[PDB]
Amino acid sequence: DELNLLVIVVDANPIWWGKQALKESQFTLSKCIDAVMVLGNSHLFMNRSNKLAVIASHIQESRFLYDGKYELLTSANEVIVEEIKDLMTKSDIKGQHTETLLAGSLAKALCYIHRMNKEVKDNQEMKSRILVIKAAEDSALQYMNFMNVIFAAQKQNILIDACVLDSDSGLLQQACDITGGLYLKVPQMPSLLQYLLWVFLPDQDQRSQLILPPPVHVDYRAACFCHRNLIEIGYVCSVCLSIFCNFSPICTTCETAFKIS
Amino acid sequence: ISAAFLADVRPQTDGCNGLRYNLTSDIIESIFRTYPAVKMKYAENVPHNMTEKEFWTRFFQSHYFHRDKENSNAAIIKRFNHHSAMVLAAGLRIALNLKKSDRYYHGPTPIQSLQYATSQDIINSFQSIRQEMEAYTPKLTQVLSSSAASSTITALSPGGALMQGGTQQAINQMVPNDIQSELKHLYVAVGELLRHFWSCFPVNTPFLEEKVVKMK
Amino acid sequence: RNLQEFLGGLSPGVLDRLYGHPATCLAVFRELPSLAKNWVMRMLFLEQPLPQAAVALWVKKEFSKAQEESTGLLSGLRIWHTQLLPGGLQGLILNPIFRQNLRIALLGGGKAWSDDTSQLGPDKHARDVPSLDKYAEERWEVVLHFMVGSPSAAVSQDLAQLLSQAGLMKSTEPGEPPCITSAGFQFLLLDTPAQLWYFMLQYLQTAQSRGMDLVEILSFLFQLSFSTLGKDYSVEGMSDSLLNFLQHLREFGLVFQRKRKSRRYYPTRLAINLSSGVSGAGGTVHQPGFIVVETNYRLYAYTESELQIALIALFSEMLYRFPNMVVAQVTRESVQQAIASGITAQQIIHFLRTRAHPVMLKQTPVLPPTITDQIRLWELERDRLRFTEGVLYNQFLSQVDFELLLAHARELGVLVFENSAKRLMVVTPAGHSDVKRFWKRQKHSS
Amino acid sequence: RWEGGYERTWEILKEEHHGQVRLGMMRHLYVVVDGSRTMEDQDLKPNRLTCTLKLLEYFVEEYFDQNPISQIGIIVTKSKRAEKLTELSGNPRKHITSLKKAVDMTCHGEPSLYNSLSIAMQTLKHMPGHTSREVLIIFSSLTTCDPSNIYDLIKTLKAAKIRVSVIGLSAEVRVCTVLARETGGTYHVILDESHYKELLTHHVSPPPASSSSECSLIRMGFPQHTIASLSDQDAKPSFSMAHLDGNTEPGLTLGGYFCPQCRAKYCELPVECKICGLTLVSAPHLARSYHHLFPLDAFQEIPLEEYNGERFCYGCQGELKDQHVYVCAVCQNVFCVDCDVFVHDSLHCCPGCIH
Amino acid sequence: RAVIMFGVPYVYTQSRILKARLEYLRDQFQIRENDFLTFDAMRHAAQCVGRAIRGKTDYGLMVFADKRFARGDKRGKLPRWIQEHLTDANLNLTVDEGVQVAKYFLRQMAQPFHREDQLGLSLLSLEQLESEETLKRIEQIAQQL
Ligand SMILES: [Zn+2]
Ligand SMILES: [Zn+2]
Ligand SMILES: [Zn+2]
Numbered sequence A: 001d002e003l004n005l006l007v008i009v010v011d012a013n014p015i016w017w018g019k020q021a022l023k024e025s026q027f028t029l030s031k032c033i034d035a036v037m038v039l040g041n042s043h044l045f046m047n048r049s050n051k052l053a054v055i056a057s058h059i060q061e062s063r064f065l066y067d068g069k070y071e072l073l074t075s076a077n078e079v080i081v082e083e084i085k086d087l088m089t090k091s092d093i094k095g096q097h098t099e100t101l102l103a104g105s106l107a108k109a110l111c112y113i114h115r116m117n118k119e120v121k122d123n124q125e126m127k128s129r130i131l132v133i134k135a136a137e138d139s140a141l142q143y144m145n146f147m148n149v150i151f152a153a154q155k156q157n158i159l160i161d162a163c164v165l166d167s168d169s170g171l172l173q174q175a176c177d178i179t180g181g182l183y184l185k186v187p188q189m190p191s192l193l194q195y196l197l198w199v200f201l202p203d204q205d206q207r208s209q210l211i212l213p214p215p216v217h218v219d220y221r222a223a224c225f226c227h228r229n230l231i232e233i234g235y236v237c238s239v240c241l242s243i244f245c246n247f248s249p250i251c252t253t254c255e256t257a258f259k260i261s
Numbered sequence B: 001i002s003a004a005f006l007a008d009v010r011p012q013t014d015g016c017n018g019l020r021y022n023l024t025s026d027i028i029e030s031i032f033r034t035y036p037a038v039k040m041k042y043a044e045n046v047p048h049n050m051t052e053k054e055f056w057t058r059f060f061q062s063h064y065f066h067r068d069k070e071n072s073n074a075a076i077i078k079r080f081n082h083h084s085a086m087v088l089a090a091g092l093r094i095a096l097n098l099k100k101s102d103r104y105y106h107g108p109t110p111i112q113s114l115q116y117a118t119s120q121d122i123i124n125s126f127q128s129i130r131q132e133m134e135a136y137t138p139k140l141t142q143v144l145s146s147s148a149a150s151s152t153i154t155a156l157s158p159g160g161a162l163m164q165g166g167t168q169q170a171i172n173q174m175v176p177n178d179i180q181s182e183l184k185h186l187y188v189a190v191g192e193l194l195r196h197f198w199s200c201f202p203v204n205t206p207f208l209e210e211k212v213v214k215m216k
Numbered sequence C: 001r002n003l004q005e006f007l008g009g010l011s012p013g014v015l016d017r018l019y020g021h022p023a024t025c026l027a028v029f030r031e032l033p034s035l036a037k038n039w040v041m042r043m044l045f046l047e048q049p050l051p052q053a054a055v056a057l058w059v060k061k062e063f064s065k066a067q068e069e070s071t072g073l074l075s076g077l078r079i080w081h082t083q084l085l086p087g088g089l090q091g092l093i094l095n096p097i098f099r100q101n102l103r104i105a106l107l108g109g110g111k112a113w114s115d116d117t118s119q120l121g122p123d124k125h126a127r128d129v130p131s132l133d134k135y136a137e138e139r140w141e142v143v144l145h146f147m148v149g150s151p152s153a154a155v156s157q158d159l160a161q162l163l164s165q166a167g168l169m170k171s172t173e174p175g176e177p178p179c180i181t182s183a184g185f186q187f188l189l190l191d192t193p194a195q196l197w198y199f200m201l202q203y204l205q206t207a208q209s210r211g212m213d214l215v216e217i218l219s220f221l222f223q224l225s226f227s228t229l230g231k232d233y234s235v236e237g238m239s240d241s242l243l244n245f246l247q248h249l250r251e252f253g254l255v256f257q258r259k260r261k262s263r264r265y266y267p268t269r270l271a272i273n274l275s276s277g278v279s280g281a282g283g284t285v286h287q288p289g290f291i292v293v294e295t296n297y298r299l300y301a302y303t304e305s306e307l308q309i310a311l312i313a314l315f316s317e318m319l320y321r322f323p324n325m326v327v328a329q330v331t332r333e334s335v336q337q338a339i340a341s342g343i344t345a346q347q348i349i350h351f352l353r354t355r356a357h358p359v360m361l362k363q364t365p366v367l368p369p370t371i372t373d374q375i376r377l378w379e380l381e382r383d384r385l386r387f388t389e390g391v392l393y394n395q396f397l398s399q400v401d402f403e404l405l406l407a408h409a410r411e412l413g414v415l416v417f418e419n420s421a422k423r424l425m426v427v428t429p430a431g432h433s434d435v436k437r438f439w440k441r442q443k444h445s446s
Numbered sequence D: 001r002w003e004g005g006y007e008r009t010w011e012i013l014k015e016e017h018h019g020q021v022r023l024g025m026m027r028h029l030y031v032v033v034d035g036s037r038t039m040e041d042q043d044l045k046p047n048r049l050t051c052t053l054k055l056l057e058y059f060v061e062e063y064f065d066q067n068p069i070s071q072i073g074i075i076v077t078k079s080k081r082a083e084k085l086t087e088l089s090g091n092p093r094k095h096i097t098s099l100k101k102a103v104d105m106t107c108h109g110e111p112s113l114y115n116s117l118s119i120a121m122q123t124l125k126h127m128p129g130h131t132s133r134e135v136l137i138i139f140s141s142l143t144t145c146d147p148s149n150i151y152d153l154i155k156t157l158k159a160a161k162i163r164v165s166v167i168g169l170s171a172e173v174r175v176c177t178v179l180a181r182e183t184g185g186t187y188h189v190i191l192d193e194s195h196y197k198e199l200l201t202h203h204v205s206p207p208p209a210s211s212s213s214e215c216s217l218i219r220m221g222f223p224q225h226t227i228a229s230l231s232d233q234d235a236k237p238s239f240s241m242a243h244l245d246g247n248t249e250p251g252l253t254l255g256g257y258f259c260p261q262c263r264a265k266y267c268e269l270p271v272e273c274k275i276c277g278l279t280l281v282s283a284p285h286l287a288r289s290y291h292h293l294f295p296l297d298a299f300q301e302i303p304l305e306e307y308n309g310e311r312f313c314y315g316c317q318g319e320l321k322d323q324h325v326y327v328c329a330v331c332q333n334v335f336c337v338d339c340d341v342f343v344h345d346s347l348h349c350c351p352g353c354i355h
Numbered sequence E: 001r002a003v004i005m006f007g008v009p010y011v012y013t014q015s016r017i018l019k020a021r022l023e024y025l026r027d028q029f030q031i032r033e034n035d036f037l038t039f040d041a042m043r044h045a046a047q048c049v050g051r052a053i054r055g056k057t058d059y060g061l062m063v064f065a066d067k068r069f070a071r072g073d074k075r076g077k078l079p080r081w082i083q084e085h086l087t088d089a090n091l092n093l094t095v096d097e098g099v100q101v102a103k104y105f106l107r108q109m110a111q112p113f114h115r116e117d118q119l120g121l122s123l124l125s126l127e128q129l130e131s132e133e134t135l136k137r138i139e140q141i142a143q144q145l
């Protein structure tokens, strides 16, 4: 009855992969896509009850991806190969927006998980996990929506694993900490697939008996809005929850004067 | 105070001829509050005119308790009204509109190193991948190598770079249990003293200064 | 016995030959425990043998038993093997052929198992999936009817001979139909998936009897396991032994085929789940329960096929035969007769639970507990007498001699029963000669 | 005289957000639970006590999930007395344990609302003005015994600006109605277990702040999880201050959370520091209530036949076969019923709006 | 909140003044004495019950503990506005049925209610008066006999 859904989110920023191609490094985006497809094939391979949901997170929007080879696996891969080429051929950069729409893809994934869970037979239980791979820089404005996604996932108890390639993002660290997911940076991108298999592929119950790398320490410092500087103790607004390092009689954000005698 | 202080309270009869009165103060106080007459009789009689148990036996056997014919109906109605009166008498004794929404978009997170790319040549790089993955063929052998697998295992091998730390020392045995309890007690003492110290803070009156000096 | 039980006892050569088929590797992997699957995924691209201690240190100490069970399953199935790692170590490395075929199956590449039917185009006489299921039921119904002996069922001679080798039915009198044995009845009371599984196990144990290659049949079964329901496949490309086996399957109804000359064949859901053995298909939507059990030990059947009528009559007394209904009564005589025929009460209780009417499913117990207990008591009464032939030793003059001979008997393990207080014991007649000779030798030694 | 004739032959025949208004950012909530004889009644299966306490555990879970900066106190009124079942704190585990222990209690006597309200007022007397004073009362029986005038207590609560909301079980009580109306709280009546859950969920959400609500600049600290390694010479195991409060020997933890103001060591967060009174919080805890600041408005409902557009949901890519389609106000996307419900209830954000 | 009338309140017939009044009215207006007694009892009961409501926002419970009220002449002699809401399924119930129906009515009527809900159904605003459909509804509400 173990219905395990493995959600895959891909950092499809064209800028980072274009630069990497300019670097002519050992690892390319095609290798990342192949590794993702292999991981999904193995996930469906482990058990029939296991299901796969793959969504591509591109700057323009989020795309739902899904001869000696398994027929259903062959069809799924050719579908995915069709989807990625379809996106890339139509991938036109029109605008100065560079940050990946990380939050929106997560919201779409959560909605799909909810839809499938409603469709789950009541005789069976659906464990769901989301795997996200990080390549380009993190997004700044999506912080509120990212926190909302984290809160919703923790409410529905969905593990979220973040995989770092080049750029570390403390947001992903905190997300994995709160959600209980696994966070790790892979230095050898070509070896990356094994890190997915050795760590991300096993289920959390399986990971319990298995010996795992220790979790990375995560900080939760706060930046005071008037200068965005990290502090230890700060003054919090009782109205709009704004943080101020210096005592103020009037709040800047909610425009409320502090009634202190 | 409830009206059941007499209806619920019954003479407890045991299995074989036992009057377990169990004269608790709670029922006695309830009766005295509801019926000052019982209090007055107890004060004027117990224990001189009659003993307390004798007074309670009289109360059980008195016609005032066993109230149980127009005169009887009138007496019952008047007693109920008086009881209700005694019970009642004893019962006596902002719209908000934000200004800077962007503060939520970049909250407690400080300014990150969002380094931007160069001139429109980035588009050329964007074209390169757009042309690099336009004609793509799946690959299997190139995905991993034996050397890469060995390096990954070595990183994941216990005691390795990724496998930071490991088993630690049993500090529980290094600290005696008596020393543990004494440390707990000293921690409690220090916590109480520091709570008193910081309770004076913030200092706004000279008295707080002297109290803090005493605490130090 | 499950699938791994037959696989776990095979010789190394058979396993190596079977691993040459990527579908076989896929089935074996899917049959592994989750921990074993994780281990295999770890060892997917490892070209170096892994130290035994290094692998063993990954799992928790508490889950070592599960780890050790997985390790033993991998070793016995020869999925991996130990290699003399340099420096005195004993590395562990997967089978190169098995791992290569598994990677071919998963990553792609290599030759497909068989061509599609697009070469022959759409089927002119294509049938329906419910029709396939009904036909498969009919064929199994035919097999059971023939086992009953009713003239409504006529099968091929070898099929009856196949059961004769299976031991279900013994030909007491030639020319006349063989008389079904007790094990035949026990199988008849088994559920259909278990029936098919045990029949195929018996077939496999006697694969060499027909001169049919053992490896080909198992690999073909694994290929059929992942087949798409409602989809036919090319008969062409298979050995004549495989052709005969497929003809046997068509006679069984596990696979649908229009004619012996047809080049297309449709696997059935029953054949699909055959690889899983008895487990796996926990959500089988079988026929609705037509049997109602009342507190008066009476059974009512909403059926008309002679198969269920015969099944019920095997253990109960028929009272009325309606056109669409059957009224029978559960009696101690009938139940004890069925037990004497070899059927166990648990089989009867399980079978009744299988065909329980949905109305009776409303009750918190599937069956009335009192009836179940009465059935169990009737079963127990049949074997009240414990018959044990043996030799009694009772002439022990000394307690020490009795204790020494008891120690010798427990060493031999031929002791039946002993009494130290009375200094008496019972031994097996076969071991009696050994113990008698030992006793004489001890007197000779004295 | 009905015996004359009787036949049944013919029977044998063929056949809710408010506006952009200030809410209760800081909450001091006290829950009042009746313990009278009426709690043994089986209005809710199996009885009032068990269902009420299970819903109370669920309510505490949701309340701490949505209000990290709130506090919970549990009071049981039994035998005309008031007993503080649980101390005022933010720990969900202790509250759940106390409720589980109270599941097997004895329900007897009568409720004493006066005493329970007096205890709550005394407890919340010293709380700061900016923090909201909220009281929830579960009233099973329709009658209570009060040693003194309750209207004086009502005046005291009004002067102390304490909000009290009551959810009765049988019917409406005039005195409780007046109390809730004057204190600014809301009075409700249980229709069934589902309605009980609905009312509890509604009361989870922060109440709107009245005009009298203060606006003060409170100072808070945000320590990290200071973890010490035994390999380092600077590893000082120390017992947690919260763990010292208990009878069991505190666990000597190598590291943890240390107060930035007085280096007080705590293993649980977010908890205000006991020594200096500083509230030690974390950034997600503050952000956990941000959705209340920007509620998600209800989307426009247009049936599929009336919508001439995409037949795939923007949220789940599911083919739109439902009778109703929910279109956003901002980005005007297409969402099915399930996605619309989940977004409004939990996600509180529109995917296209993020885009 | 709850008014319970224990039986039909028939006047003690021994009053010869009552007897004389009944005889005179029968001899001067052909009025049955029993009919007058039943009408007086029902009028007294309705007076005892009619004071439990102060308006639309006021809800109260009416209980009649007597099987005699099931008589059509006795039942039919109730005020129209009260007898109209007397559902026939509630005629001659038991204690348990009455208690359960009272609980259901209380829970239904204990739900919070708004004066805005009354608009157009039982209450009229300034603009609702000008609607001629509302005027027709008002004319249909009251009847002359
Ligand atoms: Zn503010
Ligand atoms: Zn402190
Ligand atoms: Zn949807």
Ligand SMILES: [Zn+2]
Binding pocket: D328, D329, D330, D331, D332, D333, D350, D351, D352, D353
């Ligand atoms: Zn939107």
